Amino acid sequence: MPHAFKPGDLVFAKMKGYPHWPARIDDIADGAVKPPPNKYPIFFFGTHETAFLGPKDLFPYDKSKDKYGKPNKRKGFNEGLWEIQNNPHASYS
Template identity: 40%
Template sequence: MGRKGKKYVKQFNVGDFVFAKVRGFRAWPARILRKEVRKMYHVYFYGTCNIAKVGIPQLFEYEKNKVRLGDVQKRANSSFRSAMDHVQKSVSNPGQDQGYFQAKAELTSEDQELESDTKSSTDSSTSSSLELDGKKLTKFNLPFIHITGDSD
C-alpha cells in the first residue's frame, strides 16, 4: 500500500541556490533566474555559465543536498570543482555574484525584445508581413523545392 495524502511539491524562489539535473549530465550547482509557467525554472549553472530551463523534479535544494551531490572528492572533474568553488563564493556573498546578475539581465533583455516584436506584429495584424531592416517580408516568401524521391 502506498502513502495517502498529498504529495510534497518543492517550492523555489528566484535567487535560490540549487543543484539542477539535466538529462545526460550530473546534478550541477545552479541558481534560479526566473520561474516559468508549468512548473519550469530558468537556472544559471555555475562554472559553465550556461542557462537552461529545468523542471521541478530535476531541482534539488543546495544546502540539503550539498554533501550528497556536491562531494568534490568523488568527482574528479576539474570543471565540477571550479563550479563548486564558484557557488560557495556566491553563497557567502550572494549580492556580488556577477555572473548570475549578468545572465539575469540578458534573460530580461531577451524577453523585452520578444515583447516588442510581438507588440509590433500584433499592431499590424491585418497583414501577414514582417518588417526587417526596413524591408517588408511576406509570410511565405520561400520558393517551393521538390524533394526527389518524394512519394507525392
C-alpha cells in the same frame, strides 16, 4: 515547511547525462526571454550556461550538498562548486 522555488535559491540541478550540478534559480531580466510555463531559468555555476528546468530536476543545495557537492572531472564542475559556496549571488555575465 518548504515554499515554491524563487530567484536566488541555490540548488543542484539534474540534466540528462550529467551529474547533479551546482546552480541557482535566476531572475529574468527586463526584456529577456521568459521560460516555458512550469519551468524556471536555471543558471549553472562553473559553465555559466542557462537551461529551463522543472522542480523534479531541482534539489535544494543545503539538503543535497553532502551527497552531490564533491569534485567531478566534468568541465566547469569544480569552478561551479567554488561559486555556489563562495559567491552564489554574483554577476557571472
